[PDB]
Amino acid sequence: PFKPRNYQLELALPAMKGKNTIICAPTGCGKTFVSLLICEHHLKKFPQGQKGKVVFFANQIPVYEQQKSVFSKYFERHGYRVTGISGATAENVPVEQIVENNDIIILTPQILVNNLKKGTIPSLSIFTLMIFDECHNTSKQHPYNMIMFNYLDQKLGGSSGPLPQVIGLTASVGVGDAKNTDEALDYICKLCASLDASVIATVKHNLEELEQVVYKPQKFFRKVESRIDKFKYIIAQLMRDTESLAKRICKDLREFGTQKYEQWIVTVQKACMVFQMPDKDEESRICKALFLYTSHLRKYNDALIISEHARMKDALDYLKDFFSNVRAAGFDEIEQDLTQRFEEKLQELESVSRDPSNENPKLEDLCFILQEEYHLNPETITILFVKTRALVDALKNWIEGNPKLSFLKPGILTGDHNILIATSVADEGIDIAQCNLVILYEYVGNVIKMIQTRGRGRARGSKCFLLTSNAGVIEKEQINMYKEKMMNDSILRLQTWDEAVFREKILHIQTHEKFIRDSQEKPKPVPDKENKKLLCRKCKALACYTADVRVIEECHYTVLGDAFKECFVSRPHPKPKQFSSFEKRAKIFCARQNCSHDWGIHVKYKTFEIPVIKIESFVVEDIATGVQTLYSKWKDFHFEKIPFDPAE
Amino acid sequence: PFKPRNYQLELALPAMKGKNTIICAPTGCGKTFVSLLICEHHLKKFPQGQKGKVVFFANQIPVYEQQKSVFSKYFERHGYRVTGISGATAENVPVEQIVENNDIIILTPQILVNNLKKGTIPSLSIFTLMIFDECHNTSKQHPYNMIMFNYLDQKLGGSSGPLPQVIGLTASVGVGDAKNTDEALDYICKLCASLDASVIATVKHNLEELEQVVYKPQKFFRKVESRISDKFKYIIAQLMRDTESLAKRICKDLREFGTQKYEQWIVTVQKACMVFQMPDKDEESRICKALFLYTSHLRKYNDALIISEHARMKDALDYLKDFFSNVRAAGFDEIEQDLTQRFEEKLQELESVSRDPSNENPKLEDLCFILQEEYHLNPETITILFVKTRALVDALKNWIEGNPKLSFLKPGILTGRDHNILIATSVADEGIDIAQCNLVILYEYVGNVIKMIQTRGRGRARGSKCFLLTSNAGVIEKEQINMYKEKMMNDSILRLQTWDEAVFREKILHIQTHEKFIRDSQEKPKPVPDKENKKLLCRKCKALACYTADVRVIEECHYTVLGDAFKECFVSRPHPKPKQFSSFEKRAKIFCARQNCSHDWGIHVKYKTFEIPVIKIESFVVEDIATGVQTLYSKWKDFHFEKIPFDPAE
Amino acid sequence: KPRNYQLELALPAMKGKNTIICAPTGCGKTFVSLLICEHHLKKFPQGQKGKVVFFANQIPVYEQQKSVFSKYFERHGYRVTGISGATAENVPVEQIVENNDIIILTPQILVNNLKKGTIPSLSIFTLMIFDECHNTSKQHPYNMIMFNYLDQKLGGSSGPLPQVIGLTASVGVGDAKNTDEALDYICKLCASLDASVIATVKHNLEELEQVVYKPQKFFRKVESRIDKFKYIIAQLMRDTESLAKRICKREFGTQKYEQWIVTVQKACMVFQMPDKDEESRICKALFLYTSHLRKYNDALIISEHARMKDALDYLKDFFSNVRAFDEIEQDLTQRFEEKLQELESVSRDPSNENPKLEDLCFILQEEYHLNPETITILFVKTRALVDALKNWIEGNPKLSFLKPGILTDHNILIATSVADEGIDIAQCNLVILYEYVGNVIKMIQTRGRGRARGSKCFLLTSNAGVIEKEQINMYKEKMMNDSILRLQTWDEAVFREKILHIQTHEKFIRDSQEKPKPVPDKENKKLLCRKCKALACYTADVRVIEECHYTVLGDAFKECFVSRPHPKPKQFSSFEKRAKIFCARQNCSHDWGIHVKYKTFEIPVIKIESFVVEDIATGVQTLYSKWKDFHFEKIPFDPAE
RNA sequence: GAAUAUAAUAGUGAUAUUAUAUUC
RNA sequence: GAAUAUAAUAGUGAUAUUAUAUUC
Ligand SMILES: *O=P([O])([O])OP([O])(=O)O[C][C]1O[C](N2[C]=[N+]([C])C3=C2N=C([N])[N]C3=O)[C]([O])[C]1[O]
Ligand SMILES: [Mg+2]
Ligand SMILES: [Mg+2]
Numbered sequence A: 001p002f003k004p005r006n007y008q009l010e011l012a013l014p015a016m017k018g019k020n021t022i023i024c025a026p027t028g029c030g031k032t033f034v035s036l037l038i039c040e041h042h043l044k045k046f047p048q049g050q051k052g053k054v055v056f057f058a059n060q061i062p063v064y065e066q067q068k069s070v071f072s073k074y075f076e077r078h079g080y081r082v083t084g085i086s087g088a089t090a091e092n093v094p095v096e097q098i099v100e101n102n103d104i105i106i107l108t109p110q111i112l113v114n115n116l117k118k119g120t121i122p123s124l125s126i127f128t129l130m131i132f133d134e135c136h137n138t139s140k141q142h143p144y145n146m147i148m149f150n151y152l153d154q155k156l157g158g159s160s161g162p163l164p165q166v167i168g169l170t171a172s173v174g175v176g177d178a179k180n181t182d183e184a185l186d187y188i189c190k191l192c193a194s195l196d197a198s199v200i201a202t203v204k205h206n207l208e209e210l211e212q213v214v215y216k217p218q219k220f221f222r223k224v225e226s227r228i229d230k231f232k233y234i235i236a237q238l239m240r241d242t243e244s245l246a247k248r249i250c251k252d253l254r255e256f257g258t259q260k261y262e263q264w265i266v267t268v269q270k271a272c273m274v275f276q277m278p279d280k281d282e283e284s285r286i287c288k289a290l291f292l293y294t295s296h297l298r299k300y301n302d303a304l305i306i307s308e309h310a311r312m313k314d315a316l317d318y319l320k321d322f323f324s325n326v327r328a329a330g331f332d333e334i335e336q337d338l339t340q341r342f343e344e345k346l347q348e349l350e351s352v353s354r355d356p357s358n359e360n361p362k363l364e365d366l367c368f369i370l371q372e373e374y375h376l377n378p379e380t381i382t383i384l385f386v387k388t389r390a391l392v393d394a395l396k397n398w399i400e401g402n403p404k405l406s407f408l409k410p411g412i413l414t415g416d417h418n419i420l421i422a423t424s425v426a427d428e429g430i431d432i433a434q435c436n437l438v439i440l441y442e443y444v445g446n447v448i449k450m451i452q453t454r455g456r457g458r459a460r461g462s463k464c465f466l467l468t469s470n471a472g473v474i475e476k477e478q479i480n481m482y483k484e485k486m487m488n489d490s491i492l493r494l495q496t497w498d499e500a501v502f503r504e505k506i507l508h509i510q511t512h513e514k515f516i517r518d519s520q521e522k523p524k525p526v527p528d529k530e531n532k533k534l535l536c537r538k539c540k541a542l543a544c545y546t547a548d549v550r551v552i553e554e555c556h557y558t559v560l561g562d563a564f565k566e567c568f569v570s571r572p573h574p575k576p577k578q579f580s581s582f583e584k585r586a587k588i589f590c591a592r593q594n595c596s597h598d599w600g601i602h603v604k605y606k607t608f609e610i611p612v613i614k615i616e617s618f619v620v621e622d623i624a625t626g627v628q629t630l631y632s633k634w635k636d637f638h639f640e641k642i643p644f645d646p647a648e
Numbered sequence B: 001p002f003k004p005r006n007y008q009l010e011l012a013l014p015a016m017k018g019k020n021t022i023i024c025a026p027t028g029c030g031k032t033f034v035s036l037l038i039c040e041h042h043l044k045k046f047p048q049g050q051k052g053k054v055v056f057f058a059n060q061i062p063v064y065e066q067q068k069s070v071f072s073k074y075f076e077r078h079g080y081r082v083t084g085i086s087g088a089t090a091e092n093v094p095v096e097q098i099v100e101n102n103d104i105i106i107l108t109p110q111i112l113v114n115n116l117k118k119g120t121i122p123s124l125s126i127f128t129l130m131i132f133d134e135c136h137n138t139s140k141q142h143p144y145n146m147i148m149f150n151y152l153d154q155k156l157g158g159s160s161g162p163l164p165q166v167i168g169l170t171a172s173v174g175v176g177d178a179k180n181t182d183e184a185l186d187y188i189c190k191l192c193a194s195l196d197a198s199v200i201a202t203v204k205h206n207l208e209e210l211e212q213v214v215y216k217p218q219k220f221f222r223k224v225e226s227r228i229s230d231k232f233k234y235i236i237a238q239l240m241r242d243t244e245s246l247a248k249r250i251c252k253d254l255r256e257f258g259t260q261k262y263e264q265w266i267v268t269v270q271k272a273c274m275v276f277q278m279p280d281k282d283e284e285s286r287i288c289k290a291l292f293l294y295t296s297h298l299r300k301y302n303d304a305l306i307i308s309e310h311a312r313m314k315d316a317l318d319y320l321k322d323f324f325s326n327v328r329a330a331g332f333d334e335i336e337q338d339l340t341q342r343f344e345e346k347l348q349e350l351e352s353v354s355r356d357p358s359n360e361n362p363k364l365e366d367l368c369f370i371l372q373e374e375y376h377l378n379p380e381t382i383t384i385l386f387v388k389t390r391a392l393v394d395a396l397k398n399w400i401e402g403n404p405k406l407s408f409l410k411p412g413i414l415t416g417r418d419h420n421i422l423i424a425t426s427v428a429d430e431g432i433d434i435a436q437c438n439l440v441i442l443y444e445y446v447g448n449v450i451k452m453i454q455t456r457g458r459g460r461a462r463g464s465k466c467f468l469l470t471s472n473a474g475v476i477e478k479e480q481i482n483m484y485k486e487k488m489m490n491d492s493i494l495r496l497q498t499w500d501e502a503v504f505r506e507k508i509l510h511i512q513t514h515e516k517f518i519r520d521s522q523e524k525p526k527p528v529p530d531k532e533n534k535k536l537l538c539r540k541c542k543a544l545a546c547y548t549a550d551v552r553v554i555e556e557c558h559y560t561v562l563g564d565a566f567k568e569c570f571v572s573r574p575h576p577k578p579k580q581f582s583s584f585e586k587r588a589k590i591f592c593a594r595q596n597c598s599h600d601w602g603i604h605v606k607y608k609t610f611e612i613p614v615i616k617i618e619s620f621v622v623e624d625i626a627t628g629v630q631t632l633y634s635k636w637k638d639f640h641f642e643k644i645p646f647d648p649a650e
Numbered sequence C: 001k002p003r004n005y006q007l008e009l010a011l012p013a014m015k016g017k018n019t020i021i022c023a024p025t026g027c028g029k030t031f032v033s034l035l036i037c038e039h040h041l042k043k044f045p046q047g048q049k050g051k052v053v054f055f056a057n058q059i060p061v062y063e064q065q066k067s068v069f070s071k072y073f074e075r076h077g078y079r080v081t082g083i084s085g086a087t088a089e090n091v092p093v094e095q096i097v098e099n100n101d102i103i104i105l106t107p108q109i110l111v112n113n114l115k116k117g118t119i120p121s122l123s124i125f126t127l128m129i130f131d132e133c134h135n136t137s138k139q140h141p142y143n144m145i146m147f148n149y150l151d152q153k154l155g156g157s158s159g160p161l162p163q164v165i166g167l168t169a170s171v172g173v174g175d176a177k178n179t180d181e182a183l184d185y186i187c188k189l190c191a192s193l194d195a196s197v198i199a200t201v202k203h204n205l206e207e208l209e210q211v212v213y214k215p216q217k218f219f220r221k222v223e224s225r226i227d228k229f230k231y232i233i234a235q236l237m238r239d240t241e242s243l244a245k246r247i248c249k250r251e252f253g254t255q256k257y258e259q260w261i262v263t264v265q266k267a268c269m270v271f272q273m274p275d276k277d278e279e280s281r282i283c284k285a286l287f288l289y290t291s292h293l294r295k296y297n298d299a300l301i302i303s304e305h306a307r308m309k310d311a312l313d314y315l316k317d318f319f320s321n322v323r324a325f326d327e328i329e330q331d332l333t334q335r336f337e338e339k340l341q342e343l344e345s346v347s348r349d350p351s352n353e354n355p356k357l358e359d360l361c362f363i364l365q366e367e368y369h370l371n372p373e374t375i376t377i378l379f380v381k382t383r384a385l386v387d388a389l390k391n392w393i394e395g396n397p398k399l400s401f402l403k404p405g406i407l408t409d410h411n412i413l414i415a416t417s418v419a420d421e422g423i424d425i426a427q428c429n430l431v432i433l434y435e436y437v438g439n440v441i442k443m444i445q446t447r448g449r450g451r452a453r454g455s456k457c458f459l460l461t462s463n464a465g466v467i468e469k470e471q472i473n474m475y476k477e478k479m480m481n482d483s484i485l486r487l488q489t490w491d492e493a494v495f496r497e498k499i500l501h502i503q504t505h506e507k508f509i510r511d512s513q514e515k516p517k518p519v520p521d522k523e524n525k526k527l528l529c530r531k532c533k534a535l536a537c538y539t540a541d542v543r544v545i546e547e548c549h550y551t552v553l554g555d556a557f558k559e560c561f562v563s564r565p566h567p568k569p570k571q572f573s574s575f576e577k578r579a580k581i582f583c584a585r586q587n588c589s590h591d592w593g594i595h596v597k598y599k600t601f602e603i604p605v606i607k608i609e610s611f612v613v614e615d616i617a618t619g620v621q622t623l624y625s626k627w628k629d630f631h632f633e634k635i636p637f638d639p640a641e
Numbered sequence D, E: 001g002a003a004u005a006u007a008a009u010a011g012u013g014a015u016a017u018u019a020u021a022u023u024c
């Protein structure tokens, strides 16, 4: 073992007393030891004729592996069996026997959800203790709350079974969209209701010890000026008529370079695919043209945004890569036309990407900050957060594409090194290297994310700069810093309540939400037995019929018959995953000319090698009327759904 | 995930062809990744309708936990359920269910032996691949060899059950008591037959790669001398003569001080003084209890002489002092009160001699010389020091900490159940991997050739050194004949690898059969249990404890006592190291109650729902009521009285 | 196709730095030599010229290196020549050196040519290369050359000195007990060679390890035999000692008794008597007794280091070689003939056999059973053991697979010793040391006997002190390596300072060690024989040639000795062996020297180590081993005789 | 492939779009 | 013949004896 902190004992104390409790402690103060202590006490509290059974809930695989290894290494010596079940090792194994024959079971929540729904696990009465890692996710349709729905449904019912103690683990419970303290109080009470918690454990009598371990990094706010247009009066006309040669085909009833323009191009593109035409032959031409036009427009928009947030050079390289991929996917008259127009004006560019006269002031401010902090301390470890995955290697190539930052060794963390560039890590996650500097490049999320991000630099002297060219970001961070105060104050206020009163308010909210969920069930579909024709979305070619489509596990959708096999092509999948009882063998694209529109994937399901498609790649025409309707999700498309039968 | 050494592939190659293989490679080359590769390939080789089941055999708990951790972390992603069963998690669990429902199972061999004997595991046919760590232990009746006994007994018999592939992992197969080449070769063949192996995988093509990753440390031999003239030994010898005279007053004992022969002698005498009966039963209990004390004190004096022989005089002095303080804290006896005074009478001489710098152990001066001259050339040296007894561990820690010349050292302890130098008794096989030691000093310490080869793993870096400090020549002799034995081993293997695999399989087979029915004959005796009820006296005070009629046998191994009569014959102390073996749980240790005795009887455990005393015959002397003759027994299975199986009744 | 570690070893020397080079025996030092020399020669401008001298303590190494250097550098346009003792004289070396760019020498040549004054100074050269530079110490020729070098260096002269490169596998640590002593020893060795750099492989160690393999060493400590033979042959010399003690006024078998017999024998050579006729008799008896006791002792030794038959046959050879039996020798030969019948029934007895021979036979059997094409080399201390073990090999039925050869084709070569590495070696698989341990240097050099993988070495002995003597050599090697690695960290300036101070120190020691010449007593003295005390000649008749050799000008002496053909004639200096000198007395036959054909006249050269010197006045008898210890009126020989 | 979460944007909202991340 | 080196054994050592090897 190892000598623990006092605030750890303090945090684990309400849990060891057998009370369902939510533990709220700063990120990286060692919640793992708290879990181990709670589990140890809970397991070794039982008599000889009875035995306990603990279940742990990690939301992601790294935490799964880590916690499993630690728990197994620590508790085996005590004579307790520790195991784990994730999606990889969940198939073709009796999970009920795995649960029964073990004392500690580390799970991803989806496993327990699926097994409860299926029936392999009768009730939650099997466990004597449930622990939720990052219990702030216990809300809405998240698997955690899906479990707690079962828990409460058993609790709030005549059917009485020994329900397990519930422990939550987090650094922030959240406040929702609360404008004041009394609303945040209601939010926290609602969460405690969702977790059936009667206690909220925080550090109080040992704060002086805790604050010598986890240091809050100072948060500097860097508001910079925007660019002042070497890439604005060039792609403008390009966008103008690349929209209007699409208007050459038909008239269609909004500033450029924004997200609204993105939404506009998207909905327009999703409104062009339904242009019914008696010619049909040239309907394909029209749709395949307009699709290309819009697909070029939106990526032009992407280039504009990337330029607006990063180097203009990367804004070019983006489009160059795009047209490269377009030329690699087969040459079309339209595609080679737009490409010709692009490369005609490309000579004017590149040279513009080569002037220091037009350099993003944001990147110059970032260069200033980095140079300063690495001058004051060369052994600085910096972590950087960006909005999109496009800006990652953009800022990377910006770093090594600069002699001023020759002291930097960029690293990537998306789906040894001085600085690590990343998108956005979910929750605390597996602990990485400790950083002395945290930079937020136009990146601001929720309050919980803000509080959790402090774990990146919980050492003394750690700093955090928020670099942006927008005020809305700044205010969006300030409101979070206020929300934290609201949360802490609401919690400290709730900790003054009597346990019973709190319990009955919780029970009240629980009964309320239960009634809501019960009455929420509704007569949703009247299945249309009419056979519908599924066409392609790009070239409008006939893909299949609804009569040929089979549904697997009430989630996935395949196509039968040898007719469809001559309608698609396939290339080996880039990231061959393994989901459920499936296995991604390859990808599936259209076959009509070199359309090559993505239709779905080709999988190996048991002893079958079958195509699985997504409805958001097809247009649902009616064989009778002709009304071409669109569906973004399969569950939105209600038709005669026939379960997949191996008899075929 | 990445960059496997080519010699690793070379070693895993025969095992990736289904061939039962013994792998022989230097310690530290990375046998774990070899295991991972063999196991992985073994798992991906099975089609869709079939599945494999690999089992890993670890001899020690740290190795168990480590391997379970690695295998779990590596094969979880692929989709293989990895689990483990040790002695701590073996009770009240469905082993059949745990074994089936998992793809990879890490076990301590005793678990499999027990569960096979119990019948919970029908046959080894459930497995498709068995891996043995430190497979050179597959000999005599070590658990590995028992498992392989079951394997062979299923193989050679009429049983046609599909047996799993067998892989062994070692750095040295050993040669045994071989004196030449074709003896070592026959030994190795016997071991391969014990493991059903037909291939011995070693590095041959990728030697140049291996010899740059695992370096053979340079060895050295330091032959010195003990103390020229010892005054400590004289005083202790005269004390010994005094005590021996005090003991000779009662009986006439029908050799040299400070030797092991005298230890054996005083053990035999102490044993023979506990079968001296008297009709008074109060003169018996007063004479035997005194003789026990005398022999014990003589023994402690001997241990002190050995300690002083190997270390400082202060170490032996503190040893004796701690002994006398311990028996003084136990409660002064009438036959021991004089001994402490006799010792304190010469304590002034001993203490004044233990401080005199001129008569100091020259072995320690040579060791200090080595340490000094080695840390002077490299101050960041990490040293590891091997000694025989733990008394020497403590002694050398106190010596290092208590010496101005070695004020640069920070000694640590590593015995049985940061820092510059690490002092340790011995490590079974390779063991868990600790920090590299570019200096391995052996202080009067030699073992088998296997340990000699495995110890080189401690310093597998370039320039790493190894010393053998001793005052005895037989030590060095043993080391060099060990090296010659290593030559014999390597050459025997190198010659076996040139043979025909079919021919080798034939030999293996006809060694296996021969052994199989040499195990058949004899081995079936059944000494008739005499039903006569015998008394059980305390070996120290000769007082009555219980009868053989009150003694019940639990699980054919342990032994308890019944009645509320035995209860008033003992007291108990909270056990210093409580454990949980099998279906038991140590709660306390049990001692006698007759006044100044307090002799070790047994322990107090919680078996199932019962709180019971478990005793050892090693601490009791048996007295036949009929004949009146007293007999001494050490092991319970040597006392063939009538076994009375344990039952929840009574 | 040069190796990288070779270039690495040559790198410091190619920077004009005086460098000692350490690298395992047989890693291609010749290539490094050629590289360094090549770079040294092509460095000079047009107006200047380069001149390199390569030393060699062995004629075979001399001819190998001369051949290689000549074949290599002839193309580039450099004249390569060599000088040895066979072609050292009747030639102007002064001009030979001047007319060449590369000169390969045996060091004694340059020493003698510097002493004679034929060569002014070492300024003539620009680069000197010492092969086996670990010999640069004491009174060795290398150290003499370096004495000249240092004398010109530290001296007031400012003449240009040549760059000094040394080649070795081990610099040695002398008798160092710790790292400091080893370190300073290595430092004074550097000062002896005026070195500032010690080049070892460090960057390309992996390559060197991939080329040269360290053979695995084993030690075999057996016990000594059982010995009736011991006592049986002992009472012979107890009886002999009894006989010798009857005319004049401890453990048998070991060296103490040997040098005891030696010193006593030398003490009987000075036992005088007025008769000078009974004197010769009693001292010839006292001579025969000791000279026989010695052979008996040595027989007792060979008995232990071999089989009893070897020692027996040795004695039977001695007694039959000393015959061509005298009246005094008749008793010894009769008492020995009365020893043969009881000795040989045990000397043929299979019961009493040497444990060392048993274990050796076992080792050979094993290693040849494993590999039938094994090449074995066996080192022994004496030649008696050479022939004895050859006879034992060809005599033992079990070893009928061996083809023993001699080194003082074949399956196993039996050898005494090889000074340093030597030339081309039969690369063996098995090296065996039969009661043979030298120093650390010769050990590391012995590693070169098997630089191939799988090669093995054995140390067969009964004495533990031998094993200890080897282990301490290993520890000494460790100390050497460590001290070198520590020296390679010092800055060159500080090192040069230390070296300079050591040089001035040692030079001061030498200059203050030189004692003046003793006063030669011109008074005459009678030089007479030691075996029979017979008057050989007087000092006035004796004349000295080349201040080294000594002859006699007198026909009276010419009739006082006999001449018999040399066992192995050879040529030295300006001389030429042909015969050998013995005492002309009937039953004496004692070695006096040799007769040679020096230049024109044939003259007899004698040794003082076979003559005892009495005084014409006092008559005091004295012994002298070397002519350097015997000071007198040294009258220079010259042709008119 | 499907589900879930977070952020921004349009909207009165149920929602929708995109971005990002996770899980089965 | 002379010179020189290495090892062993005596000696506090300077040295000496012996063995082995080399060289002019
Ligand atoms: O595409 P899958 O059906 O196999 O499922 P998945 O996990 O990748 O979903 C990711 C989504 O992003 C799009 N996608 C998938 N791939 C392989 C690519 C892309 N988009 C780009 N630009 N390049 C790719 O290689 C899919 O639409 C999917 O829904
Ligand atoms: Mg699914
Ligand atoms: Mg001469």
Ligand SMILES: [Zn+2]
Residues within 6 Å of the ligand: A536, A537, A538, A539, A540, A541, A590, A591, A592, A595, A596, A597
């Ligand atoms: Zn299409």
Ligand SMILES: [Zn+2]
Residues within 6 Å of the ligand: B538, B540, B541, B542, B543, B592, B593, B594, B597, B598, B599
């Ligand atoms: Zn008792």
Ligand SMILES: [Zn+2]
Residues within 6 Å of the ligand: C529, C530, C531, C532, C533, C534, C583, C584, C585, C588, C589, C590
């Ligand atoms: Zn004579």
